[PDB]
Symmetry: C3
């Protein structure tokens, strides 16, 4: 019926993003992705707290899918028989059937193939939504990711100038709700199913126990720090599927920021901190001007410092004293 | 003194909106509204929880008032003798006297008439504000609604194109604070007055027990689902008088969105989720492309699924397979 | 090395702002500021609750620093020997070294001098950030202020028209976390150090006990009410270093509002309520049209009325009946 070229995509684990063109002269294609659901218990903090996670492709967040405006996205979703729950998928980028949720419901042992057309550009959340109280449960359990729909001519500043990024990272923020016991220790559970009751009581009080980038406290620090060099223009995509976030690059700015995350609107310029609406993704580009460590955080500093929400960037290059200088090092007050 | 034609308006109960023109060739008029305050106990959930509500015109939210830029809005507010508290009204659309609160204070048995000029276009909250700690109390009790001030030429996209809506619905989101007892059951009270102490202790902890559209869990589902047909351009006005919200049309987008809700600013385009600042209203227009059920939610999915915050839309028309198709129905994993 | 004129600035205590030009024909200068850190116990409410505060220059927020685009800001930070903790400073307006935090760490008895170039216009937060869990602690303790970086040609509406303000006030909103005892009374502590453990447990639950403008409940009411006259264009700068706020001028509007607070973006017009992202500052200008009291609030009315977050404005001039009139004073219902 639909007579167009097919392109397969190997998805990569966040914060990386599969190779793709920014501007392109290709026409619309059918872009094929596979997602496999994995239920598993995982360690979310350095003190060893465990969590019944549910993931697309074994990661939190799910991998980022990149396509251009007009492409058709054909997704195979697989719920292996080792999973215990029905799952589905809804794309905020898609039109109809609750974003696809209503066509994609699959029990363990099943798979489904869905095609939707990419009519709107920007970055959009995808997430599981099986029904009723299960919706919030699967999402705060890790079943959310994002999809970026680029314009064929690539990004622009709204004033006719191309904005080309040299690299792109995907940062998925996850609010997690782990209940404590009488003594105030986090509880461990055998199955997602048994975690459900206690997790649900706690979720309704709306205060997360952990807020983490990429699935774990510290995931994007040390050896897994994001990297750049002075002069590189870096795009950061940030999703939050349930609760608002306020990302900030410490030492840096957002040179161009789509805080609503939709590229038919012109980016704002020069931001210190931006706002990601719960249930959405946004994008911010910055050209690094100085080397050293930067921290990428949500500027609820309690969340940042105390609940897990910090990534590091490690940037190489030449210090610029014109931009910033220590005039006089610490010293006794005269 | 003010020599202009008078127009009376029969207000309708949300989510409907009284008949009005979008663009108009009439000159400024004095538009006359009546609001009567009702204190009453009401059922807010399907398990029968009750709540001491205080309302304009017996509904939550108050009815939506529509007028054009330059009109004079003349409002009669009535506090019948069967009410037990003084009430007033403040319009965010109005200039001076705490938005009118300071001229509109009335005890049970009294009424007052206020006129203000509509100098600013957009959608704006109105709410009771009697004074001190009473302000938050009356608002989270239901005494808030909205008023839409259209431009005489109707809405535009910012790029010179008219945006005409075929219908408009008003969705009022209410954060409610109902205290539990020692056993963890919601408490019932005889009077608003007696609910005050317990409600106040709980309010200060800032976590609502229920978040509802149009006064009740389920109010805008089943028989009272919002409706449209494929091809209709629908405007949704959303108010939140105290706490932020993040509305999302599941299966749909915001084609044009005034998230700050003021029509002197150009709408943003193509949104997945938008943000209604506490103490404000916003507006989003969407042309339906596909039939079926859509859910309108705040994309805090805990609030949506677990605390009451979901409306349904039921849309008639022809499925479009080009936009979205089930390629392969659920099936055993090969 | 850097061969330019030096200008000293005497900082003033908020909500006032040191004298400065809006548009200017001066070239880039080195602008020199001194900040001295003060740890002290202070009264934050009318019932006499005390709080271990940490401040720049003995106030909450820190004073507002004003400079123009291209200036070099040279800041002497002093940590006197009567303080018990190391402190530093990070500017969101600055580029590199965690906004300066990584060059400015000083123990009691020390001082440091830092210079950064003002490449981006807008209003930006500055705050202490010593490291780890200490970051949120020092900030919610009062160690945050703001810096405004004006364009040399002054502010504009985005459509080529100058916007000149007749006065400017700086409103710093502080979320504070004071723990209660078993009986439910606020606790007093001898030292910042001893407050730390209890404050930290409470901070992680993310619900502040007090939200105050300018350091105290009632600080900007009564004798210290902000003032204006009908016809004055007033700029209000609002910072929030950790948690979001939704400012609203009751009786008024935001005629021009930079909600993200960066002047390379055009202001929005006609707002009822705007949003200050946690970790940022914004600015709103309003021309007063009517006399009387206005309240400036965050339109979480619980925060406003119940947790400390209200300022008053007292405006002189002639009432305008065309804008708003009491047609009929309170009276018995016929
Ligand atoms: O030591 C018993 C005493 O402790 C409480 C705590 O309030 O409950 C604990 O002990 C129960 C019975 O031994 C456990 O089942 C319960 O789960 C645990 O919290 C009281 O119930 C009891 O009187
Ligand atoms: O069974 C009595 C025991 O229960 C507590 C709960 O901590 O209080 C309950 O009983 C009181 C006196 O019977 C009631 O007035 C009170 O309101 C109820 O919670 C204890 O106070 C008491 O020791
Ligand atoms: O009256 C003693 C009784 O009260 C509790 C409250 O649960 O604790 C109080 O008394 C303790 C010992 O007297 C204090 O150290 C404690 O800090 C205070 O809360 C119980 O522990 C105790 O059984
Ligand atoms: O200790 N369990 O609730
Ligand atoms: O059970 N009443 O608090
Ligand atoms: O009463 N002190 O926790
Ligand atoms: Cu799932
Ligand atoms: Cu969603
Ligand atoms: Cu009232
Ligand atoms: Cu209000
Ligand atoms: Cu400090
Ligand atoms: Cu910061």
């Amino acid at each position: 019926d639909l007579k167009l070229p097919r392109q397969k995509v190997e998805l990569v684990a966040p914060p990386f993003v599969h190779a793709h063109e920014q501007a392109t002269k290709q026409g619309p294609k059918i872009v094929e992705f596979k997602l496999t659901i994995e239920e598993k218990k995982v360690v979310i903090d350095e003190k060893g707290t465990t969590f019944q996670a549910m993931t697309f492709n074994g990661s939190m967040p799910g991998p980022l899918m990149v396509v251009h405006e007009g492409d058709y996205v054909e997704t195979t979703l697989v719920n292996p028989a080792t999973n215990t729950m029905p799952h589905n998928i809804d794309f905020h980028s898609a039109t109809g059937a609750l974003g696809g949720g209503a066509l994609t419901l699959i029990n363990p042992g099943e798979q489904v193939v869905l095609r939707w057309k990419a009519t709107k550009t920007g970055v959009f959340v995808y997430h599981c939504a099986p029904g009723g109280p299960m919706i919030p449960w699967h999402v705060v359990s890790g079943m959310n990711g994002a999809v970026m729909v680029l314009p064929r001519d690539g990004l622009n500043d709204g004033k006719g100038h191309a904005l080309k990024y040299d690299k792109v990272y995907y940062v998925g923020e996850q609010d997690m709700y782990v209940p404590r016991d009488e003594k105030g220790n986090f509880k461990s559970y055998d199955s997602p199913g048994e975690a459900f009751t206690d997790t649900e009581e706690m979720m309704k009080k709306l205060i997360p126990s952990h807020v983490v980038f990429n699935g774990k406290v510290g995931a994007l620090t040390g050896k897994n720090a994001l990297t750049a060099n002075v002069g590189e223009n870096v795009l950061i995509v940030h999703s939050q599927a349930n609760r608002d976030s306020r990302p900030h690059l410490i030492g840096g700015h957002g040179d161009y920021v789509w805080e609503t995350g939709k590229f038919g609107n012109a980016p704002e310029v020069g931001l210190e901190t931006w706002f990601i609406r719960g249930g959405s993704a946004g994008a911010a580009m910055y050209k690094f001007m100085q080397p050293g460590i930067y921290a990428y955080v949500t500027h609820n500093l309690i969340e940042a410092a105390d609940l897990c929400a910090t990534a590091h960037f490690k940037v190489e290059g030449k210090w610029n004293d014109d931009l910033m200088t220590q005039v006089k090092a610490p010293a006794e007050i005269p």
